[PDB]
Design an enzyme around this catalytic site. Structure first.
Site, PDB file in Angstrom:
ATOM      1  N   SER A   1      -8.209 -30.355  33.105  1.00 41.26           N
ATOM      2  CA  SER A   1      -6.828 -30.780  33.364  1.00 41.26           C
ATOM      3  C   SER A   1      -6.606 -31.324  34.777  1.00 41.26           C
ATOM      4  O   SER A   1      -5.531 -31.852  35.053  1.00 41.26           O
ATOM      5  CB  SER A   1      -5.779 -29.694  33.056  1.00 41.26           C
ATOM      6  OG  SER A   1      -5.809 -29.378  31.670  1.00 41.26           O
TER       7      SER A   1
ATOM      8  N   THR B   1      -3.901 -28.953  39.557  1.00 37.49           N
ATOM      9  CA  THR B   1      -4.678 -27.750  39.294  1.00 37.49           C
ATOM     10  C   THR B   1      -5.457 -27.889  37.992  1.00 37.49           C
ATOM     11  O   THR B   1      -5.220 -28.796  37.188  1.00 37.49           O
ATOM     12  CB  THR B   1      -3.782 -26.512  39.211  1.00 37.49           C
ATOM     13  OG1 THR B   1      -2.948 -26.605  38.048  1.00 37.49           O
ATOM     14  CG2 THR B   1      -2.908 -26.393  40.450  1.00 37.49           C
ATOM     15  N   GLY B   2      -6.384 -26.957  37.786  1.00 34.06           N
ATOM     16  CA  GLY B   2      -7.182 -26.936  36.576  1.00 34.06           C
ATOM     17  C   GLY B   2      -7.782 -25.570  36.363  1.00 34.06           C
ATOM     18  O   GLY B   2      -8.183 -24.896  37.315  1.00 34.06           O
TER      19      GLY B   2
END
Lengths: 243, 244, 244, 243
Positions: free
Chosen positions: B32, B179-180
């Site tokens: 993501s 973010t991920g």
């Protein structure tokens, strides 16, 4: 260590109108220091009027990406542009800057900065040495509005003139300055997890004249600058606080 | 090296490394943070127009979080998770366009074919099925995105930067970061809830100063909190000192 | 210019004029459009509480038409004629509170002392004995009332808006307005039944859109009907056109 | 210029139960068009069920101040929210909208709007081109209830399911849609002094199913929206009319 202090005082009566909290904890003024520094700059001749001098941002100096690159005293009070304040103090020099601050009787009046770092002219009002309480902010603003400070009346009037203006409910005309800062950690670095926000100034409606200072110290990070959020909350609260 | 953290901070104006902790060459699923290049691919392909267009609605057949069953535009898509919005972009692209776009980007190993025998390249490749990228490769991609130097239209690159989530930091910094979160693959292609990892990549800017960064934390113990948000909050706290 | 009509329509969201017909600075008596500021004064002074309180009864010694000899609350007071309800509010205020309240409002010429020698400030000032206001000043007062920007408590201003009569208009408009009817004063301060005038002032709102208006018609022929209701019905018919 | 028409038809027979007036005058459907537009929306996939999609009001679009800001297909039929219908037609585009209406055989099936204004997608069913008579409303509703329309039976069942429900005296269960509009004057502007109101739908009780449409065209302004007043009057009248 997370609180909010609010002090509202009548200029004419001098009496407390509303006080939440002890209001005596000192923290760095952050960019509420632009109010006394404007007064110093006008008195020293560094600043001239609301549009003079207009300075251009120089590469290597600190400013937000959203800040305007060409700044006069009026825009200086609206944007962050830390370099503008630092250019004023640089033209004063260490000795004139310290004597000016002592003549103001502003907080602890300590602009020497951190020991061994030689940062009094660049960081003292950000957390390096200079601190002030909400009650002392009000004390300074009351003296500024009474023309009683040992500075020329022309410099005092120009300081009041560049103060940002805001509208509050119930026809309150508010003149106020925000300030955003961060408590220092062990190493002396700004701690994003401990933001604090100022909103200080004065307000008028019909016959009534008040002076105020709100300080909020948090222990959780804020996604937005805390100063503007404190101001917005206070603008909504000021009709209820002033009755 | 089961558990590690890597941080790479690079200056745009000088091209030099500002701060590097760790080797920063361990390849891991983008999970993501891939919404940054997928947004670029979407704008360039015409599937996406601007930060408010297109506004797609969740449909009853599409599996999604409780809070993700709503109308979503590219801005909201980057702010929240909304995995189905990403899968609708890749569905419109098709396998051939999607593989060609990622290969043209030189993004990580550029492998979006997914797990063999599962046909999940369009839906799971950036979540652990095939696509991997390192922190130094993420900084490399981000560095070219900021200068409009990727082999795509400058308009598509500018729109990608404009929908990135923004965060305020001390000392006048403004951080644009994504973010991920995910899990490390096991011995033979399966999630491992004992090895979670978190990303926070993007760029930060003041007047006349731009920096690009990637932070990757891989743990060997489970965690209640998603790792992405925790990695972001710690990096935003560290970025004032890592930047000087 | 003995006979004329003036219409001023202003946008709240932009502060700009939407439509102005005529100069709109001719001052005439408010004539029960004064029920709007008198309600605000009543709520702020504690004489009035809400739309249903207090409910006062007509008493046999009081001047009133047949339909007004009943129980009246603020809602009915703004809806019906009920001149005696207004007179009871000003009696409870007293001359010095009433004069200071109107001066604090900056409402028109702010003169509620009545006709000299007649001591009718508390009973006839807004009916033509002293108090006058222009359409532009009506809009200025109403604009501040709608935003809670008058020097009164936001509660009193909210209750004043809640008791305003409401009418529906085409294109999803809802109009909150108050009518007013009277006659122009002559050369030496007496009613001129040949010069009737009518008010319709208030605000209109759709979702996310608020406008403030005032229409004043001054005639030179005696009218069949009271002029207030005729000015209102014409304005309600015109408001969809004037608002775009 | 002023009249009231009422047509009540049996489903079990198709025969007229009660007819007052000629019932052939065509006027704009106003928001009774939300029934065929719901059928079009479900068939085209723009609408999914009673709760999906939920759209949010966006600034600059038309809605009553009393309308809810978040609308799904169920709330869409209860509030005014003209923007919800306009977003549906915008996603269809000019040609799919005209082709859908033509397949429906709805009134005069003219959604091209006024010539030179290019408002077919925004004003056609409000008075710009599309008109329908009470007898044509009953004809459309009878084909909707029989599943005869050339649309998916999923879309037809969902249109019936979001139809507002009202209770009428003598145990009549009523599914009805209200509509309010205004006749245009010379330059095509709505005339507040000439309002009209619809109430159309169907009703069931024991072994009897009826379909109905009521239209009142007035030549004097209405204090409140005419539509709800026509509905309330019809709900009172329906036990006597269906006898």
């Amino acid at each position: 260590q997370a609180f909010e202090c609010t002090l509202v005082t009548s200029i004419e009566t001098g009496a407390i109108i509303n006080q939440q909290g002890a209001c005596d904890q000192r923290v760095a003024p952050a960019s509420t220091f632009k109010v006394p520094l404007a007064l110093i700059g006008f008195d020293a001749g560094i600043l001239q009027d609301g549009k003079t001098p207009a300075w251009d941002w120089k590469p290597g100096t600190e400013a937000r990406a959203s800040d305007r690159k060409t700044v006069d005293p009026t825009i200086w009070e609206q944007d962050s542009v830390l370099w503008y304040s630092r250019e004023i103090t640089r033209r004063l020099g260490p000795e004139k800057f310290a004597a000016y601050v002592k003549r103001l009787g502003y907080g602890n009046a300590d602009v020497s900065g951190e020991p061994g770092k030689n940062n009094g002219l660049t960081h003292s009002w950000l957390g390096a040495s200079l601190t002030i309480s909400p009650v002392e902010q009000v004390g300074f603003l009351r003296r500024l509005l009474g023309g009683n400070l040992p500075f020329s009346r022309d410099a005092q009037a120009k300081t009041r003139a560049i103060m940002p203006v805001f509208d509050a409910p119930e026809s309150w005309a508010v003149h106020g300055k925000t300030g955003t800062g961060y408590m220092r950690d062990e190493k002396g670095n700004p701690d994003r997890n401990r933001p604090f926000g100022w909103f200080v100034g004065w307000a008028e409606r019909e016959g009534q004249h008040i002076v105020f200072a709100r300080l909020r110290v948090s222990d959780k990070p804020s996604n937005e600058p805390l100063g503007p959020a404190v101001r917005d909350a206070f603008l909504r609260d000021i009709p209820r606080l002033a009755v």
